[PDB]
């Protein structure tokens, strides 16, 4: 029962307990209508995610009830739209699509603005805030690779143009884009799905898969989802969506040559992935992220909920965790969602 409030971004801490500041952190893929329902009314998460096992029917009337029921600002829904091979709503927005591979060659960058905007315009309808896209990813793997036809180009410059077209096109249709999986999953040594995943030189990064990011975190709104990779001269054998040192190169951009940036940053999946449940369960995997400095932690399902936020809260109490670093990423998730209407 948390009301909704007319409050700023900057004081929206001051009207949370403890635990549902937390919750505010935390984003959650659902079963159906009636799963979605109850961890929102039971624990008041930050938001949902429509993922793989999503029943779809719960865009039919029973997702508009569960965004009103909840505070004290609008309800985040997330989804994986990418198109081609990622594209889960392609039963209600005009099919899959070309992939981003398929679109670079035969599409203008202003032609992939305009399909962009209307994908974003018929998800904004449903109830959609937010799409874990565009890829920024550099490869020329092949198509059906785990990146393979999912990136923009081979070529950093083209990848910039056009993926910043789709960002700019969500963002037309007032849908918040996430630009994937910093710093760089193109030449990964392989699937963060089913195993740990290293990346080329940070100073080979620096020259070539950074290099869309340095313009195209810059327009906002925007935010940045961190893979699952280990990173030689800056992570070690922990996951950059782990490691405070990738988040922090995030945020001061100077080592990239980017400007600094103080949008919302994603972990990727923590749960239903075996490069993080491979080392860690859930509720740790959780903390670690927020600890890295990230300010949405992303998992596939509601059930660890109860536990992750028990485990939170004694971080909280032992000083594993500060508040300043709860408050400052609920003012981030507050900007993100934007205010309340009647305010």
């Known amino acids: 029962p948390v009301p909704r409030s007319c409050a700023e971004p900057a004081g929206i801490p001051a009207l949370l307990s403890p635990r549902d500041?937390?919750?505010?952190?935390?984003?959650?893929?659902?079963?159906?209508?009636?799963?979605?329902?109850?961890?929102?009314?039971?624990?008041?998460?930050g938001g949902i995610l429509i993922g793989s096992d999503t029943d779809l029917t719960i865009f039919d009337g029973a997702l508009a009830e569960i965004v009103a029921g909840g505070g004290p600002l609008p309800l985040a829904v997330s989804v994986d739209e990418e198109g081609g091979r990622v594209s889960r709503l392609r039963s209600l927005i005009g099919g899959t699509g070309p992939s981003a591979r398929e679109?670079?060659?035969?599409?203008?960058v202003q032609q992939v603005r305009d399909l962009a905007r209307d994908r974003g315009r018929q998800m904004r309808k449903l109830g959609i805030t937010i799409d874990f896209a565009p890829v920024v990813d550099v490869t020329d793997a092949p198509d059906d690779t785990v990146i393979g036809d999912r990136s923009f180009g081979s070529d950093p410059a083209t990848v910039t143009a056009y993926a910043g077209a789709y960002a700019q096109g969500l963002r037309d249709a007032?849908?918040?884009?996430?630009?994937?999986?910093?710093?760089?999953?193109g030449?990964?040594?392989?699937?963060?799905?089913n195993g740990g995943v290293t990346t080329p030189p940070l100073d080979d990064?620096?020259?070539?898969?950074?290099?869309?990011?340095?313009?195209?975190?810059?327009?906002?709104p925007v935010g940045v989802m961190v893979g699952h990779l280990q990173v030689p001269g800056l992570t070690g054998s922990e996951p950059a969506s782990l490691?405070?040192?990738?988040?922090?190169?995030?945020?001061?951009?100077?080592?990239y040559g980017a400007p600094p940036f103080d949008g919302p940053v994603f972990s990727d999946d923590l749960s239903g992935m075996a490069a993080i449940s491979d080392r860690f369960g859930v509720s740790e995997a959780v903390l670690r992220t927020?600890?890295?400095?990230?300010?949405?932690?992303?998992?596939?399902?509601?059930?660890?909920?109860?536990?992750v936020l028990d485990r939170l809260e004694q971080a909280?109490?032992?000083?594993?965790?500060?508040?300043?670093?709860?408050?400052?990423?609920?003012?981030?998730?507050?900007?993100?969602?934007?205010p309340n209407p009647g305010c």
């Open 21 to 45: 500041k937390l919750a505010q952190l935390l984003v959650v893929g659902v079963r159906d209508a009636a799963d979605a329902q109850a961890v929102v009314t039971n624990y008041h998460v």
């Open 103 to 108: 679109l670079a060659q035969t599409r203008t």
């Open 174 to 185: 007032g849908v918040l884009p996430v630009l994937k999986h910093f710093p760089g999953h």
């Open 187 to 193: 030449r990964g040594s392989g699937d963060s799905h």
């Open 205 to 220: 990064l620096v020259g070539d898969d950074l290099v869309p990011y340095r313009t195209l975190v810059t327009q906002a």
């Open 243 to 255: 490691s405070k040192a990738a988040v922090n190169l995030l945020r001061t951009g100077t080592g």
């Open 290 to 307: 927020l600890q890295a400095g990230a300010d949405i932690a992303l998992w596939v399902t509601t059930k660890e909920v109860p536990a």
């Open 316 to 338: 909280l109490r032992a000083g594993e965790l500060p508040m300043s670093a709860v408050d400052r990423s609920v003012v981030r998730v507050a900007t993100m969602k934007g």
